[PDB]
Design a binder for this molecule. Structure first.
Ligand SMILES: O=C(O)[C@@H](O)CS(=O)(=O)O
Ligand SMILES: O=C(O)[C@@H](O)CS(=O)(=O)O
Ligand SMILES: [Mg+2]
Ligand SMILES: [Mg+2]
Lengths: 236, 236
C-alpha cells in the first residue's frame, strides 16, 4: 500500500518526511500555477532560486534565452521581466526560453524537497495529470504545501486534497495520514475549490493586489496535462 | 483583535509561535482527558514528565501522596499505579494525591509549551470552560495539538475546532489563522465529534487496545468546568 502524507508549509519540511519519496510541491496562488503554465506553453526550463542576487547571477549563465520572473510580497521585482501572474507567461513570451524565478513561498518549498526521489510540481491546473504521475511512480508520496510565509494556507491545502482525491479515483491501495485525510475531506466537501479558498488569509492579499483574474485562472481544473519535475536545480 | 493559531503536533512546536501567548494543550485520547478528569475529581496536582526514570525520581520527592500513571504505546507502564484511562482516576483514588505522569504525546506537548504566558489543559470534556478562560485571559492564543507520534491527528484537531468554536460563541473580535479556521470548519461540520474521529489513524489504535469506553467518555462535551493550568512544572 502506497502511503500519502502532507506537509503544511515550507517552514515545516523535515527531511525524513521527504527523502526517497514522491514529493509534490504546491503553491497554487501562484508559483506552481506559473511554473505549470509556463512549461505547458513551451518554456524550455524553469530555474527556481531563493534570492534576487542568485537570480541575477543565473541570467548570466543561461545567456540570451534567459528571462527573470517571480515576486516579492506578490509584486513584480525591480529589474525583472515578468511578475508572478500565470497569464503573462504566454507561448509567445516563453517558448524556448529559460525562466529564472524566485518567489515568496513556492521556490523555498521546491528547494526544501531536494532529498525526495522525485519532485513533482502540482497545482489545480495539472491536478489530474499529477495524480496519474504519482500512480506511475509507484512510490510513497508526500504533498508539500508551500503555505504562505511559513504557515498553513487553505489554498495549498485544498489543492492537496483535490490531488489526493484524483489519486483515489485511480486507486484503492492507499494509506493516508490524518493530514492528508483532512485535506481530502476539505476538498471533497468543496469540490469547486473557488468558494472555500476565499476563507484563506492569503486570498485577501491576492484581492488587494487586484489579482481576481489570476485567482479565477488558478482555480481551473485539469487544463494542463503536463507534470513538471525538479531535477538537479532545474524544472522541465 | 485576539489572534488564534494552531500547532499540529508536539514535534511541530516552534517557540516563537508559543512564547507569551495563551497556549492550550490538547491530547484528547487520552492524556489531557485524564489530567482534566483527575483534577476535577480532587487530585491535588499533576506533575508531567518525559521519562519513566524521571517519574520514579519524582515519586520520592512528593512522598506518600504520590501516584504513578500514564502509558507507553497506550499500555500501563510496569510498576506504575494506573494507566492512562480517565475512568481509573476516580475521586476515591485521586483525592488529595499527587499524580506523576508520563505519556506518549500529551506530556511532550505540555513541556514544549513552557514559554507561553499561560499553559491551559484542554479536552472535549472542558472545552466550554477553556473557551471561557481564553476570553478572560484576553491574550492571543495558540492551540497546541499533541498529535500522535509527532503527527497531525484528527482527534486533537477536531477538538481544537470545538474549542475555537466555543471561543467564537463568546466573541466576534477574533482573527483565526488558516490552520485554526480549518479545524473549526471540521468541527462545525461534525459537531458530534465521535463520528469524525473514527477516521483518525489513532482511533484504530484505541480500538485494538479495547478502549471503546475511554473513547466514548472522552467525546463527552462540557462535563468538566475546570481548566487545569501548567505552571512551574505542575498542573493545578
Ligand atoms: O505574498 C504574496 O502575495 C505572494 O506570495 C503572491 S504569489 O506567491 O505570487 O502568488
Ligand atoms: O499510542 C497510544 O495509544 C497512546 O498515545 C494512547 S493514550 O495517549 O494513552 O491515549
Ligand atoms: Mg502558497
Ligand atoms: Mg493525541
Amino acid at each position: 500500500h502506497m502511503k500519502i502524507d502532507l506537509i503544511i508549509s515550507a517552514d515545516d519540511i523535515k527531511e525524513e518526511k521527504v527523502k526517497n519519496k514522491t514529493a509534490v510541491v504546491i503553491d497554487m496562488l501562484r508559483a506552481t500555477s506559473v511554473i505549470t503554465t509556463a512549461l505547458n506553453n513551451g518554456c524550455k526550463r524553469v530555474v527556481p532560486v531563493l534570492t534576487v542576487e542568485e537570480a541575477l547571477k543565473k541570467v548570466k549563465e543561461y545567456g540570451k534565452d534567459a528571462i527573470l520572473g517571480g515576486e516579492r510580497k506578490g509584486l513584480k521585482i525591480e529589474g525583472f521581466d515578468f511578475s508572478n501572474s500565470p497569464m503573462e507567461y504566454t507561448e509567445d513570451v516563453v517558448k524556448g526560453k529559460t525562466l529564472i524565478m524566485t518567489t515568496t513561498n513556492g521556490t523555498r518549498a521546491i528547494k526544501g524537497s531536494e532529498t525526495a526521489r522525485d519532485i513533482l510540481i502540482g497545482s489545480v491546473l495539472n491536478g489530474e495529470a499529477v495524480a496519474e504521475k504519482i500512480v506511475e511512480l509507484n512510490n510513497d508520496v508526500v504533498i508539500v504545501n508551500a503555505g504562505t510565509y511559513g504557515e498553513f494556507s487553505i489554498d495549498d491545502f485544498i489543492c492537496s486534497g483535490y490531488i489526493i482525491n484524483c489519486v483515489m479515483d485511480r486507486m484503492k491501495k492507499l494509506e493516508l495520514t490524518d493530514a492528508a485525510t483532512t485535506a481530502q475531506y476539505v476538498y471533497k466537501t468543496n469540490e469547486d475549490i473557488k468558494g472555500f479558498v476565499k476563507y484563506a488569509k492569503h486570498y485577501k492579499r491576492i484581492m488587494e493586489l487586484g489579482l481576481k483574474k489570476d485567482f479565477e485562472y488558478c482555480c481551473k481544473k485539469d487544463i494542463v496535462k503536463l507534470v513538471p519535475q525538479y531535477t538537479n536545480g532545474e524544472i522541465l
